[PDB]
Amino acid sequence: MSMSYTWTGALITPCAAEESKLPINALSNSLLRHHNLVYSTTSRSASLRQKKVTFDRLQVLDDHYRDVLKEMKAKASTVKAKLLSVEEACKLTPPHSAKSKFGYGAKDVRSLSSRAVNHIRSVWKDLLEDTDTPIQTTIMAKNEVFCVQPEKGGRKPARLIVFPDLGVRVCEKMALYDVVSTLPQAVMGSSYGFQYSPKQRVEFLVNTWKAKKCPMGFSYDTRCFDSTVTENDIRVEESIYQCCDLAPEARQAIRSLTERLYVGGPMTNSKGQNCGYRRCRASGVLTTSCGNTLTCYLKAAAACRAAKLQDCTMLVNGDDLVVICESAGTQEDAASLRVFTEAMTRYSAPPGDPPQPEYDLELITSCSSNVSVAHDASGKRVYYLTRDPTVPLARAAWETARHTPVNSWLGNIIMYAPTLWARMILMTHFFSILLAQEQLEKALDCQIYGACYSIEPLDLPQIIERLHGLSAFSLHSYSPGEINRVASCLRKLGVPPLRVWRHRARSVRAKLLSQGGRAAICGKYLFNWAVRTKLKLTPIPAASRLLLSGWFVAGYSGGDIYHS
Numbered sequence: 408m409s410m411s412y413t414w415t416g417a418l419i420t421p422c423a424a425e426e427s428k429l430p431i432n433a434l435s436n437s438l439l440r441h442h443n444l445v446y447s448t449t450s451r452s453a454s455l456r457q458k459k460v461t462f463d464r465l466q467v468l469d470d471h472y473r474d475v476l477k478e479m480k481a482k483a484s485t486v487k488a489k490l491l492s493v494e495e496a497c498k499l500t501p502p503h504s505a506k507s508k509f510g511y512g513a514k515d516v517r518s519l520s521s522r523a524v525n526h527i528r529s530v531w532k533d534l535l536e537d538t539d540t541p542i543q544t545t546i547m548a549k550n551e552v553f554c555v556q557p558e559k560g561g562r563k564p565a566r567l568i569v570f571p572d573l574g575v576r577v578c579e580k581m582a583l584y585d586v587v588s589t590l591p592q593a594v595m596g597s598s599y600g601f602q603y604s605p606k607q608r609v610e611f612l613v614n615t616w617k618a619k620k621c622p623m624g625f626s627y628d629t630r631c632f633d634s635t636v637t638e639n640d641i642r643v644e645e646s647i648y649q650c651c652d653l654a655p656e657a658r659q660a661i662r663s664l665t666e667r668l669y670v671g672g673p674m675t676n677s678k679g680q681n682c683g684y685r686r687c688r689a690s691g692v693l694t695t696s697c698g699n700t701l702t703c704y705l706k707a708a709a710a711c712r713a714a715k716l717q718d719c720t721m722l723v724n725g726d727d728l729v730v731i732c733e734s735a736g737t738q739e740d741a742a743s744l745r746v747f748t749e750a751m752t753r754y755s756a757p758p759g760d761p762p763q764p765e766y767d768l769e770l771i772t773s774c775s776s777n778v779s780v781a782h783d784a785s786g787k788r789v790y791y792l793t794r795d796p797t798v799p800l801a802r803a804a805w806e807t808a809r810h811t812p813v814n815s816w817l818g819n820i821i822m823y824a825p826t827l828w829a830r831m832i833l834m835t836h837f838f839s840i841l842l843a844q845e846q847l848e849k850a851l852d853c854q855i856y857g858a859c860y861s862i863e864p865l866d867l868p869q870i871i872e873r874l875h876g877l878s879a880f881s882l883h884s885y886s887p888g889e890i891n892r893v894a895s896c897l898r899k900l901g902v903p904p905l906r907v908w909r910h911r912a913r914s915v916r917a918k919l920l921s922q923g924g925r926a927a928i929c930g931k932y933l934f935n936w937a938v939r940t941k942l943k944l945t946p947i948p949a950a951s952r953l954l955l956s957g958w959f960v961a962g963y964s965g966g967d968i969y970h971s
């Protein structure tokens with residue numbers, strides 16, 4: 408019976424200026440024309456989110472819980488993690504990461520400046536000596552762009568982000584980076600989502616579904632998961648980590664960060680005021696993704712048992728959960744789901760929207776996406792992942808009319824390269840603007856599984872072939888429902904129909920070829936679809952020449968991570 412937060416009454420304030428509406432760009436209109444449906448969240452709506460994330464939590468454990476837990480620990484005891492040298496940790500820090508409140512920022516930290524490495528060592532030392540004093544944190548209102556839509560009733564309030572000082576963040580890396588990059592797959596195997604790349608996730612979902620006599624799957628939407636995490640859940644996560652083979656120093660740092668940071672602590676707004684007290688999951692620490700994934704999996708696996716699901720397979724990504732199993736008849740399936748929901752609720756994890764059995768894999772949404780079909784060169788049936796393009800396009804627009812240090816369009820192109828909208832619009836629109844400014848060589852940052860990466864457009868052809876397979880460049884004969892969903896979206900926002908883009912694609916793939924080099928390798932592989940005349944595409948040379956491990960190994964959302 409512990410509230411997830413307590414509030415002092417002080418407002419959540421912003422630091423920088425917050426743009427609510429879309430500007431007045433002319434390229435932005437080349438993408439979207441209904442600019443009034445696009446919008447960003449601001450600290451103005453922060454109090455509404457506060458209401459939502461604030462509630463009492465009731466939790467009642469049971470034998471199924473302890474059993475699964477015990478099983479997890481067993482698997483964890485087979486994991487050995489190392490500490491990260493201050494230097495190593497410092498490098499995993501993002502150039503733009505929020506500056507330390509102790510005078511010094513990201514570059515200072517990244518360049519191993521004296522001052523920074525000093526404070527960091529002090530903070531570390533302090534963790535080893537003090538194990539109880541709650542570490543201070545800052546709470547801001549996130550600013551993300553969405554599309555207005557009355558079906559839901561208007562606008563979504565801003566999300567909240569709770570994080571500790573830069574000094575602390577580096578310590579987290581040192582004491583837990585190896586754990587959160589290895590412990591997950593160790594305990595849950597195939598159920599751990601972040602070990603898969605697009606091509607792998609698709610293959611995993613499809614195969615699991617087809618392995619069932621009569622498949623039945625459901626996604627579980629938890630009402631504000633982070634707020635449902637209890638102090639006991641976080642302490643349990645800690646015990647799991649401790650099952651690892653660690654250094655005595657790492658153990659003490661983990662216990663201290665757990666008791667002083669993870670379980671809870673005071674929060675101040677940007678103006679340094681006492682905002683409230685947190686007794687749930689911090690949204691902006693290193694263990695957020697790892698912790699939610701472990702806790703979601705724990706409750707869900709125990710819930711499955713109370714529900715008696717048959718031959719069930721789980722796929723967990725943070726709080727995002729999808730379960731596939733053998734059906735026991737439609738009525739039994741519904742009842743089993745209501746029990747699963749009852750056990751989750753008991754484990755302190757009720758749902759927002761109630762789960763519903765689904766018997767069509769393509770009608771299931773997990774990780775904001777669904778499986779769909781298309782065909783390859785030899786007309787072979789190819790499965791891929793997609794989603795409604797609305798948000799991606801509203802954001803793709805916004806980033807065209809306003810500068811964003813971290814875009815999303817490029818990320819979406821990487822995550823959804825095989826989709827119709829990605830290939831024909833995003834790809835087209837962006838190589839267009841690039842060319843009109845000569846920046847095809849300039850790298851830009853985008854996030855993948857929460858981690859930051861500096862990527863160069865010129866490499867998409869390889870990146871893409873790696874993540875989705877060569878077929879991704881020749882997919883055709885997309886399912887009508889998918890083709891319909893898109894065109895429906897375009898007409899809703901003001902985006903020229905696929906035809907207007909099929910035009911530009913040639914008009915663009917042209918200027919790209921009459922440039923050879925790398926810009927050529929692209930315009931050929933990425934736009935082979937926009938030409939009746941189709942030249943044969945084969946394994947790209949430097950498709951292998953490039954390290955891509957770090958990419959799909961674990962989740963780091965909210966973890967302030969950067970990879971090179």
Ligand SMILES: O=C(O)/C(=C/c1ccc(Oc2ccccc2Br)cc1)NC(=O)c1ccccc1
Binds near residue numbers: 608793854855857963
């Ligand atoms: O922030 C996160 O933690 C994050 C998690 C996440 C979990 C699972 C997932 O599965 C899919 C779903 C569809 C296609 C391929 C894959 Br692998 C994708 C993302 N989002 C991005 O990485 C992300 C990056 C760019 C664009 C959008 C999201």
Ligand SMILES: [Cl-]
Binds near residue numbers: 886
């Ligand atoms: Cl269809």
